[PDB]
Nucleic acid binder design. Structure first.
Lengths: 33, 23, 255, 507, 33
DNA sequence: GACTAGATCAGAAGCAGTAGAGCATGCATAGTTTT
């Protein structure tokens, strides 16, 4: 149980962080320019 | 006849190359 | 059905349930101008087997490689479904730039919602990630639960609480384990439900479970008084009565 | 020795051939298939014009001209190819064994006489000329017919008939739980029963090791480059044959294929004039050369006439002491000159006498050599070559003459003048120690051409669709670690004694 | 244990679609403007 | 009578080897330009 839960949560924080990177990049740079 | 190649009759079975073997 | 009008495809994968000649025949029947060797014109390179030829095409970034499943999908729907990361395994620089805008480093995309199968495939895409430590992962999990309001889930509700047990004849001594009692199963079940079981009685302990043995209640109370932060005294019955309810019962009735 | 080799691979399909004695071991069927594939690859690389076939006995299905029962001729006698190897590959693994069982069947009765009859019929079907005819029997049942004596007699009679016809038989016995003993039945069928091949073998035959040893070098049958006339005078002439014992190996010439459909395309080069644009026959063209700011024009026929000096052959000029020949005067690979009695009768006696006397007097015959027509003559030396045999009496040096080309004055070049510096005895001794440390025995066949081996490996991988090509180990690369370990501190002493403290050879 | 995986996947999908609508709104509004 | 089989010779095709031509890579040196 612990192994499955931690693996899934880490694997998903990776993807959410990637999307957060792109959305921050957009909202900041593409709005400033 | 002795030491004859089993793949190509009429030719002697060439030994494998051993490169350099120091004494 | 001319869904494959004036297009070129190059198939170098015969190791499949359907034989390669069957693929050529189907493509020809659909109208695709099949070609036996890729060139400047070939639209793509179908290959379900990563043979030496496929690796050779991989080494040259001039051409794409599409899994055979794309052709099967095209035949089934009789429509030119666009390429997706699930099918492709190598992209020329122009295509890689093209996808980088509408898709992530992984299969998940930005402009199109996701489903269970898509997320499962994206997850299978990742290889591994083990750069974290238990404390960092626990803190991240707790922060996520607090932020997204997921504390109502049946599990992970013991995460925020550290639990100590009276499984040692003497407090803070690891050489007097009392294995062979219901306290072991209680501790293990608590940890299964997300509880952080701590083997050392640190100042950060917030929960303590005591069984039928009340001999050392005085010691626990004295330690609680000494510590700046006080931990409520609890009994093994509280967790047993709470598990069936899947909620944190009030500690006033089991102090 | 003229013709082609025809080979038939008989593989037993009994139950005992599909059982593994140990968990980590290869079943007899797997080993037989691996050997067949290795032989196929070796034949493709070495002799692609040979004929091979694959047959099975003991299967449930049947496929043959005679329509015998329980004999399936998977592949008839034909030139080897990648398609046959790929077809055989589908029986390599356990899944392959199940596929073979489903497609053909196994565990049925059989008669060896019918199998030999089918093999003989397959041999007769071939329309080419066969220099050799051979059959190999892969089996692990030393007593195929123990219950029926008549079947054994029929098999013995068929084997005798095949031997009389000129068909060789080999038994490649495979591992058996109780051991394979040839003395029960296979003494009569086997063509040759060696004295040592009578005890019980508890392990597979050693011939399988030879079969699995892949040969990746082209083998060329004996052929005479030319049949020339050696003229000791205008009246005394003998016939000789010229051979090339050493010839450089080249990659097979590339072929041009069409991209779309993958079929050969033929090329053709045509010359045309610019103004008119029509074709230009060779008779409407000439040759030019600019010397002294002038143009000299000669027809093609005259251009080829310029090279005509004398008729093809070898013209005797005299005899020279062998000490006057210089090793560092090598110009072209040497050839071999042998007698030939087909054209002139009595040449052998004169050639033998000349060879014997040249060996006795240590002399070489100087001659003028003209291989073909319209070829400028060259100067050659025929050095006597005695017959040298190894321990097993297998000839290693044939008897005859060694033809070595001698250079003209134009073939030599002038080297820049350099002052000579002689090393003192200490440095010579240190280098002698270094040389003695790295002593080794050299032979003509101790190295392989890495380029050709890599090309063959890549071609095989592409043809058979292997996951990755096999990487050939290059024996020509020096073993730096071994030399460093052996030399030890000798190199440091030599560098101290020969180089100044600040020399920096690299820069 | 046999249901925790679906429990996790549901929440992960939901958060992903929410922020996906966020990024879609950002991109569409900027491109229009 | 009709028909086939085996021996014999020549013609033609395939393959091996050589010579001749063409196309990359380097660099050796000198010439020219810049400071």
């Amino acid at each position: 149980k612990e192994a499955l839960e931690t693996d899934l949560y880490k694997r998903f924080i990776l993807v959410l962080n990637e999307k957060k990177t792109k959305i921050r990049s957009l909202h900041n740079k593409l709005l400033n320019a | 006849c002795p030491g004859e190649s089993l793949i190509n009759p009429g030719f002697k079975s060439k030994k494998p190359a051993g490169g350099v073997d120091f004494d | 059905s001319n869904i494959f009008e004036d297009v070129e495809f190059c198939v170098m994968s015969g190791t499949d349930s359907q034989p390669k000649p069957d693929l050529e025949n189907r493509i020809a029947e659909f109208g695709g101008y099949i070609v036996q060797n890729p060139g400047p014109d070939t639209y793509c390179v179908i290959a379900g087997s990563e043979n030496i030829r496929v690796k050779n095409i991989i080494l040259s970034n001039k051409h794409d490689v599409v899994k055979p499943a794309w052709l099967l999908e095209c035949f089934k729907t009789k429509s030119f479904v666009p390429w997706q990361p699930r099918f492709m395994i190598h992209m020329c620089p122009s295509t890689k730039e093209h996808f980088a805008r509408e898709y992530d480093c992984y299969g998940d995309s930005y402009f199109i919602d996701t489903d269970l199968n898509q997320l499962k495939e994206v997850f299978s895409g990742i290889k591994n990630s083990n750069e974290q430590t238990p404390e960092e992962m626990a803190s991240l999990i707790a922060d996520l639960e607090y932020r997204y309001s997921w504390d109502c889930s049946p599990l992970s509700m013991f995460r925020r609480h550290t639990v100590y047990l009276d499984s040692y004849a003497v407090i803070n001594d690891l050489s007097t384990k009392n294995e062979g009692t219901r306290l072991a199963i209680k501790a293990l079940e608590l940890r299964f439900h997300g509880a952080k079981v701590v083997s050392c009685l640190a100042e950060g302990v917030s929960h303590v479970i005591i069984g039928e043995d009340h001999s050392r209640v005085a010691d626990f109370k004295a330690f609680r008084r000494t510590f700046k932060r006080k931990f409520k005294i609890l009994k093994e019955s509280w967790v047993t009565d709470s598990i069936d309810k899947c909620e944190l019962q009030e500690e006033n009735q089991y102090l | 020795y003229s013709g082609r080799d025809s080979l038939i691979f008989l593989v037993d399909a009994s139950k005992a051939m599909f059982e593994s004695q140990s968990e980590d071991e290869l079943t007899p069927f797997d080993m037989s298939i691996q050997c067949i594939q290795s032989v196929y690859i070796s034949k493709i690389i070495s002799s692609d014009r040979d004929l091979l076939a694959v047959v099975f006995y003991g299967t449930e299905k049947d496929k043959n001209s005679v329509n015998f029962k329980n004999i399936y001729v998977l592949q008839e006698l034909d030139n080897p190819g990648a398609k046959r190897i790929l077809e055989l590959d589908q029986f390599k693994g356990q899944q392959g064994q199940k596929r073979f069982q489903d497609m053909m069947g196994h565990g049925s009765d059989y008669s060896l006489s019918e199998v030999l009859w089918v093999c003989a019929n397959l041999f007769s079907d071939v329309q080419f000329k066969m220099s050799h005819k051979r059959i190999m029997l892969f089996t692990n049942e030393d007593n195929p017919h123990g219950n029926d004596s008549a079947k054994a007699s029929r098999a013995r009679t068929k084997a005798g008939d095949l031997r009389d016809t000129g068909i060789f038989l080999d038994l490649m016995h495979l591992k058996k739980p109780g051991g394979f003993d040839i003395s029960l039945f296979y003494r009569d069928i086997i063509s040759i029963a060696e004295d040592e091949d009578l005890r019980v073998h508890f392990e597979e035959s050693s011939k399988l090791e030879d079969l699995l040893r892949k040969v990746r070098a082209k083998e060329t049958r004996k052929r005479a480059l030319s049949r020339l006339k050696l003229k000791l005078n205008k009246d005394i002439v003998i016939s000789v044959g010229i051979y090339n014992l050493v010839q450089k190996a080249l990659k097979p010439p590339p072929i041009k294929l069409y991209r779309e459909t993958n079929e050969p395309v033929k090329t053709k080069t045509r010359t045309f004039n610019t103004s008119t644009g029509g074709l230009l026959l060779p008779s409407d063209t000439k040759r030019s050369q600019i010397y002294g700011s002038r143009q000299i024009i000669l027809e093609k026929e005259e251009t080829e006439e310029l090279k005509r000096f004398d008729d093809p052959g070898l013209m005797l000029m005299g005899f020279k002491p062998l000490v006057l020949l210089k090793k560092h005067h090598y110009l072209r690979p040497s050839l071999f000159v042998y007698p030939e009695e087909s054209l002139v009768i009595g040449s052998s006696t004169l050639f033998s006498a000349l060879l014997i006397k040249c060996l006795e007097k240590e002399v070489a015959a100087l001659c003028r050599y003209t291989p073909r027509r319209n070829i400028p003559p060259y100067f050659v030396a025929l050095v006597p070559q005695e017959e040298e045999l190894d321990d097993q009496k297998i000839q290693v040096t044939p008897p005859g003459f060694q033809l070595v080309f001698l250079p003209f004055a134009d073939d030599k070049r002038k080297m820049p003048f350099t002052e000579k510096i002689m090393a003192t005895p200490e440095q010579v001794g240190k280098m002698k120690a270094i040389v003695e440390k790295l002593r080794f025995t050299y032979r003509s066949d101790s190295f392989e051409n890495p380029v050709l081996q890599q090309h063959f490996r890549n071609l095989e991988a592409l043809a058979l669709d292997l996951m990755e090509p096999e990487q050939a180990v290059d024996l020509t690369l020096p073993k730096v670690e071994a030399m460093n370990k052996r030399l030890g501190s000798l190199v440091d002493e030599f560098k101290e004694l020969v180089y100044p403290p600040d020399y920096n050879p690299e820069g």
